[model samples]
Target chain A: GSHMSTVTTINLEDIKEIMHTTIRLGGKPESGEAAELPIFLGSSVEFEAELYDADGTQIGTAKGTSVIFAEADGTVMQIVSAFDDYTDGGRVTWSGAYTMFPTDEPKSVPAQGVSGRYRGLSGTRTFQLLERPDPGTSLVRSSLVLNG
Target chain B: VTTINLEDIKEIMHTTIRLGGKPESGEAAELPIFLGSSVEFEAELYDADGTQIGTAKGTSVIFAEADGTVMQIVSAFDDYTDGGRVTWSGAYTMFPTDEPKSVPAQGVSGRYRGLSGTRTFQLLERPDPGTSLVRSSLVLNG
Candidate 1:
C-alpha cells in the first residue's frame, strides 16, 4: 500500500528521539575483573528502535537480538531483525551482519530479505550516528532492490 | 531431454525459535527470532507417466533469519528403478515471502548420471498450514 518501485527505497527517515532501548543478554566483566585475553569475546543484546519513512511517518518498528563482539577492529554484530511496518502489507523481515569501526560509523551492512511483501530484498542497512548510543541516536535505512 | 516429476515428498524439518524463528505469518508474530532449520526427506519418483519408477532420500540445512530471508543447501540421492544411481547437491534461497525456492542442480550424475537442471520447492499447499507437500521436477538435459 505504501508503493513499490523497481528499486523500493525505504530510508532511515529519523534517528528516533526516544523509546529506543537495548538490553544486555550476557554477563559483563566485573569492575575489578579484566576482560578476556583476545578481547574478542562476544556478548548478546536485544534492542528495539522506531522506524519512519522519508516523510517522517511512523513506518513501523524494528527489534533485534544479536551477538556483538568488539576490539581494536571495532564491532562485529550479527543480527536477526524483524521489521513491523505500519502498512498492513508492508511487514517484511531480514538478517544482517554489521561491522562498525572506531569512527562509530556502521558500514553499509548487507542483508538478505528473509521474507514479506514487495520483498525486493537485497542490499545494505546503512546507518548514520548523530550522537551517543547510550540509548540510541542514529538513522538507519534499507536500500532494498525490490520484490521476490 | 526428460522431465521427471515427484508427487509428494515427505519432509521432516527440525526448527529453532528464539531470537531467531517461525514462518507462520508475515507479521511480527514471534520473529527477530533468527532460526535454524534442518530437513530430512524421502519421496517416490516418476519418469514417464506417473509410473512409480524410483525413490529418493535427502536432507538440507536452512537458515531462516528475520526479514523473511532464507538460505539453504540440499543433498539428495535417487535410486532409479532402473540401474542408475544419482546423487545431488545444490543450494537455494527463499525470502520469508514466497511460494517458490529454486534449487539448481549444480552437479550431475547422468540419469544416476540424465542431465542436470533444477528442483523447486512448493510453498502453497492443500492443508494450508498442515499436511504440507513437496513437488519438484527434475529436467534431464541428455
Candidate 2:
C-alpha cells in the first residue's frame, strides 16, 4: 500500500476573545524567615482563547494553565504555564515562563516562542495580547507555520 | 557518548547559527529561494534565572506577491510554562533586493521584564541558498 502526505498552510488571524481567570492554592514564607516577604504557593491561572480567520470564520481554540508565584506585597514574581492548541485533528503544545514585576496594572512579559507538531507538519507559534475596544475584553492573536 | 538532562540545561543556549544552512529535513526549498526566500529557526527556553524550560520554534513563508513585494506569515511561540505558554502568529512581507534585506516588524504575545518589547527579527547577513547558513537575530520589544 502507498500513502500520500499533503501539506497545507492555515492562517489564524484574530482572537475574538480571551478569557482569563485566577485561583489561589496556598503560600510559603520567603527564605525560611517567618516575617520576610512570603512567597505564595499552589496559585494557578487559566486562559481560554477563540480564534478566527481573515474573513471572520471560526477556525480553532486554545487553552493554557500557569502556576503563580507572588510576593507578600502582592507583587507577582513569576508564572510558568503550559499551553495547548486544538484545530481539526491537529494539536500543538508548549510551555512558558513569565517573569512579573510590581505594578498597578497588568505588565508585559518578554517570552520566547514555543514549537510543536501538528498532524504531519512541525513548526513554531507566537502570541500577542492587546487591549480591545470593550473594557472587559482583550484581543489574543496567534500565527502558525508548518512544514511538510 | 554524552548525555544531557533537562535539569542540566541552564540557559537558552545558542547551539548553532548557520548563515545559509539547508532547511530542516523533509522541507522543500521553494524555487527562487536564492533571490528572496522565507526563513525560520528553532530555539530552547530557559528561565532568566537559569532553569530548563522547553522548546520554541516557528517559520515565515510567502503567501502572496505583487510588484516585487510579497506577503508572509510569521509565527512564533514561547512555551516554557506548563499548560500556560504564549504564542503569536501573523502576516507581513519583506523586500529582498534592498541593500539590507528586511521585513516589517510584527507584535508578539507576553512580555519579559528587563528585556526589549518589540517582537521582530532582522536578516543581519545571508548567503545564496545552498551556499551557507543565514545570520540573523530576533529583536524583542523594548
Candidate 3:
C-alpha cells in the first residue's frame, strides 16, 4: 500500500510607500483650436518634478507633458509622465486627466483633481500649485498611491 | 453648474513591479493566483458623495501551456478618479519563462459618468528567472 499527497501554497505580500514631489511648470502649453466638430480646444503644457523619499532623500525624478482641450468655457487637461528612479534603475510612467478650476485672484489657476497610473499600479493623485514668495518660483504638491 | 465635456480628456498610465513571489517559494501557491486561463473583472469609481462616476471591466486569456506565455486583454477606467478605489478579479497562468525585456501590445477602454475612451496597455516587464514582478502601462486617447 502507498499514499501520496500534493500541496500548493502561495503567499501575498503587500507594501506601501509614500513620497513627496516638488514640481514646477517649465512653460505654458501652445494653444490652438480645431476646425471640426471635436474642434481643437486649447494648448498643452509641460513640467518636471523632483521626487523625494519619506526621509527627504532625493530618489528620483519625473517629466510631464500635457494636452488641454476647452469645454463648456472650462478646460480639461490630460497629462502624461515619465519617471526614473536613480538607485534601482526602476522606471515608471503614468497619465492624469484633470478639470481646470478658475480662481478669482489674478495669476491663479488650480486643477483640483487627478487620476492615473504608476507602472502596473493604478490610482489617483491630488495636486496644487501656487506662486512661491520668491520671484519666478512656484510650489507644487502631489500625493500618489499604487496597489498590487 | 455647467455640463462637463467628457470628450475633452484622455488618460494614460504606467506601473512598476517592486516585488514578486515564486511558485517554488515557501507558501505562495496557496495564495490566489495572479494570472489564470480565463479571468474576469468589474470595477467602479465613486465620488466622495457616493455617486458612481466611472466603471471598468475586462477579461484575460492566458496561454501558458503552449509556450512560456502568450498575452492578456483588459478594459478599465481611463478617466476620472474616485479616490483610487479599484480591484482585480482574475486567474494566473503560471509557467517558467525568461525575463520579460520588451513591451507587448495591449488595449484598454471604459465608460465613466457617460464618458468613454480607448487606450493602449503595454507590458514593461515579464516574469523571468530572477524576479516575478511584472509592470505595465496604459495610454488613453480622447
Candidate 4:
C-alpha cells in the first residue's frame, strides 16, 4: 500500500459555540413568533414587513398593506397581505393566518393587523402578501406571494 | 435589431435637459430641462409615426464632483401611451472603469470622466415577445 497523508481535524467546543452564535438561526417552527395584524373594512392601513435576525437585528424591510381577513380563534386571525421591495419595486402577495400566543392574557394581545405594497408606473400601489404554510406539515415557515 | 450588451453599457450625463415628448412619441414637447439638483427625461419605445416599437428610457445620474460619472440610473417606463414608468434608486456612486466612452449630443471630452450609478426599470405592461406596440420612459437622478 502507498503512504497516504493523514489530516488532523480540530473540533474545538469554544469555536463551535462562537460559530453557533455568529451563524444566523435558520427557520424553525419552534422559533416562530406570532403578532396581531389590524384590518379595517372601508379604510386601509399602510404596512411593511421587517425581517430580523434571531437577536432582533433588522436585516431588510418590505412595504405592503392588508385587504382581506379571516377570523379563526378569538386569539388569532388570518390576513391577505402584499409587499414590494423598496429598491427593486417587485411586488408579491400572500394569504395566511397567524396565531397570537401572547405571554399574558389581555396584555399579551393577539396578531391583528397585516398589510403590503407594490410600486407602480405612476406611483406606489397597495397589494396583498399571501401565506402558504400549513400547520400539520413539519415545515412551519410562512411567506408572501403576489396575486395575478 | 440592435442589441445592447450590458458589458459594453457606459453611463452618460446631459446637463439641464429633457429628452421626452408629450404630444409626439419620439419628439419632445419641450426640452426636458434639468431643474436645480434634479433632471427629468422622457423615454419613448416607439417611432415618430407611432407605428414602430422602441425600448424603454434609460436615465443615468451624473456626479458633478466625480467628473460627470454615473451616480445611478433611476426608473424605466414602458408603454408611454398607457402611462408606464420604471425607476431605480439606491447606492449609486462614481468610480473608475464605469465611465461611458461617448454620448449622443457631445462627443468624448478628456476633462469629463464617468461615475457608477444604480439603475432601475418599471414597465406599464409586461413585455411579451408577441407585441410590437411598446413604449417606455426613464428618470435619471443627477
Candidate 5:
C-alpha cells in the first residue's frame, strides 16, 4: 500500500501582531487628571509595526515604532530620517527613533530650528517572543510570560 | 596479583521469550528463546606495578535459544582507554557444522555464538556519556 495524503487544519494565532501603548503624562512625579490622562493624548501620535517567524517548534516576534504629530490635526508631516534594524536571533532590536518637529505649517503657530531640523533618537530595546516550531501552532496553548 | 575468575562475575540479568504469534514462514509453532538484559559489569583491575588501576567494566548482553544449544552475546561494549577496558563481544553465527564434546573454557573458546546486538554503558556516580541518566526497566510484550 502507498502512503495516504491527509489534510490537517490548524487555527494558528501564534504569529500575533500585538500593539501595546504605555503613556506617562507631564513628568515622573505628576498626579491626578494630568497623570490619569486619556490614551492617544497630546499632539503625539505613534504607530508600531512588527514581524515574526516560526523557529523550529518555537514562536518568534518583533516590533518597531513610528510617530507623526502636529499642533493641529491633519498636517502633512514628512518622514525626515528613520533607521531600523534587528539582530541576535531576532531577540534584540535597534530602532533609531525618528524625531521630528513640525516643518511645513498650514495653520500652526510658528516654527523653530529644532522643529525644522530632522534628528534621530538613538537607543536600544530588547524583546523575547516565544519560538514556534511550525506556522500551525496555536497561541491559546502556548505560554507567553516566560517563553522566548 | 590474583586473577579473578571471570565466572565469578555476577549474572546481572536473565530472561526468556517465546515467540508466540503466527509465523508467516517455515514453522507456525511458538519458538522459545532467551535474551540478556543490558547491564554494566564492573570489577576492579590492577596493573603489573601492583597499583590499583581504575575500574574495568564490560557492557554486555547475551541471547540464547530455548534448548540452550544456540547461545551467543548479541552485543559487547567496553572501554579500555584510561586504565583497562575491553570489549569481548564479537561477530554473530560463526559456527554451523557440529557441536563440541566438552564445554569450552573462557578466553580459549572457539567462537561466540550470539547474534549482534547493541550495548550502552557509563561510569558509576558520574555523568553518563551514552545517554541521559535514567533508571530503565524491561517489559515483555505479548
Candidate 6:
C-alpha cells in the first residue's frame, strides 16, 4: 500500500482529443452557429471543444480563434490558440498553420508552445472531421497531443 | 534570395484582446501570467518620407501585465507592405533577446512570392504619441 496518491498535473508525455463537436454544444445534438467558415484574407473563425483524455473523461475546455493569411500556392489557416486545463489551472498558449486537406481527411498540424516553460514542452494538434449529418452544420473533431 | 531595405511608420493603431482576458480560461493565480489573456492590433505602414506603404497586424501574448503603465511586446506578426504580404509566427520583438530584435517571414503575393528569410528590425520611438519608425533589412531566399 502507498501512503500517497501519485499523479502529476500534466504528464511529460500525454495526448488529448478536443472533441470539436462543431454542430453541438456540451456533447449535445443541436445546431445553430454557422460552421462553414468563410474564406478571405483577414477573415477569422472561432472554435470551442471539450477536452478529454484517452479514457474519454472530461478534463477541460479548448477554445480560441484563428485568422486567415495568403500563402504562395493558396490561402493558409494558421492560428494562435489557448488550452485550458481546468483540473489544475494549467494553460498552454500555442499556434500553428493547419490545413484541412483531402476533403474529409484527418490532418495534424504542428503546434508550437508559445508561452510557459515553452521549449520545455512542445507537440502537435491533429484535427479529425466527424460525420456531417447536416451539411450546413460544420461539426468537426480534432486532437491535442502534448509532451514535455 | 534577394535583399532590400524598407521603413514603416505606423499610420494607425487598433487594439483588440485575444479572448479579451477570457474569464472562462480562469483567473491566472501566478506571475508571468499567460495563456488566454492577450491582445492583438492592426497598424497601417508607411515609408521614411512620411508616405503610406502598407499595413502590419500583430499580436502579443502578454498585454495585461499591468494597468498603470503603457506596454511593449514580443510576439508574432503578419505584415503586408508594398513588397508583399509576409508572416512571422515566432516571438518577434522590437527589444529582442539573445537572437536580437529579428524574426523571419514566409509570405505570398508580389515580390514576397515563394520567398523566405529573416528581417533584423531596428525601432525608433518617435516623439509623436503611439508612433514609431520601424526599419528592416529584409534578406530572403528566392
True contacts kept of each: 0.00, 0.00, 0.00, 0.00, 0.00, 0.01
Q: Write the per-residue lDDT of candidate 4 for residues A23-110, one digit (tens) a residue.
A: 1111111211101211112111233445433454443344432211112112222122332232233332222223222212111111
* Global lDDT of each candidate: 0.40, 0.37, 0.29, 0.23, 0.22, 0.41
Per-prediction DockQ scores? 0.03, 0.02, 0.02, 0.02, 0.00, 0.04
Give the best candidate by lDDT: 6
Off by over 4 Å in 1: A1-19, A28-41, A70-80, A84-88, A112-116, A133-148, B1-142
TM-score winner, 3 or 4: 3
TM-score of chain B of each: 0.54, 0.37, 0.28, 0.25, 0.27, 0.56
Clashing pairs in 6: none
Q: How closely does chain A match the true chain A in each prediction, as TM-score?
A: 0.54, 0.51, 0.48, 0.26, 0.22, 0.53
**Ranking of predictions according to DockQ:** 6, 1, 3, 2, 4, 5
- In terms of TM-score, which candidate is strongest? 6
Residue A122 local lDDT, model 3: 29
Over 4 Å off, model 2 = A1-17, A23-39, A68-80, A83-85, A98-117, A132-137, B1-142
Under CAPRI classification, how is model 6 graded? incorrect
Tens-digit lDDT string for candidate 1 (A1-148): 1112234444433334222545332322222212221111123334566666556666556664444322222222333333344344554333334443332454443332322442333334454444654644434543333221
Residues B1-142, model 6: lDDT tens digits: 3555553443454555432211122122221122222335566666667677776666543221111111123334445545665544443321222223565554334555445566455544444434444454455564
Deviating ranges (above 4 Å) for candidate 6: A1-148, B7-13, B17-37, B63-81, B92-100, B120-123, B126-137
| lDDT per residue (tens digit) for residues A7-115 in model 2 | 4454443435454543333223123222142212233334566666666766666665444332223333333333345545445544333334222233322222222
Mind giving the per-residue lDDT tens digits that candidate 3 earns over B1-142? 1122222111112222111111232222342222112222333433335455554443332222122223222222323343122222111222222322221111111121111122322233434422222222222222
After superposing candidate 5 on the true structure, give the runs of residues whose Cα lies further than 4 Å from its correct spot. A1-148, B1-39, B48-50, B65-70, B74-86, B91-142
Q: CA shift at B50, candidate 4, in angstroms?
A: 14
Candidate 3 residue-wise lDDT, A24-131, digit = tens: 221111222111112111122334556555466665555543332222222322223233343445433344334443311222111111122222332233445543
> Which sections of candidate 3 miss by over 4 Å?
A1-41, A72-86, A102-119, A130-137, B1-142
Candidate 5 per-residue lDDT, tens place, B94-140, comes to: 12313211111111001111111122222222233232221111111
lDDT per residue as tens, model 6, A1-148: 0012112122322335443322111111122221121111122334566666657677666665443332233322234443444444544444554542343666654343222332223355665565655523344555555453
Instruction: Rate residue B39 of model 2 by lDDT.
Output: 38
After TM-score superposition, the amount by which residue B125's alpha carbon in candidate 5 deviates from its true location, in angstroms, is: 26
State the lDDT of candidate 4 residue by residue for B1-142, as single tens digits. 2111122111122123221111121111132211111122433344335443323432322221113222322222222233222222322332332232221110001111011122222222323322222222232221
iRMSD in angstroms, per model = 15.2, 23.9, 23.5, 26.0, 40.0, 17.6
Per-residue alpha-carbon lDDT of model 1 for B1-142, expressed as tens digits?
A: 4454444433322222122223233322232422223334566665435566666665443432233233444555556666354444444553332456664331122232323445555544435322344554443333
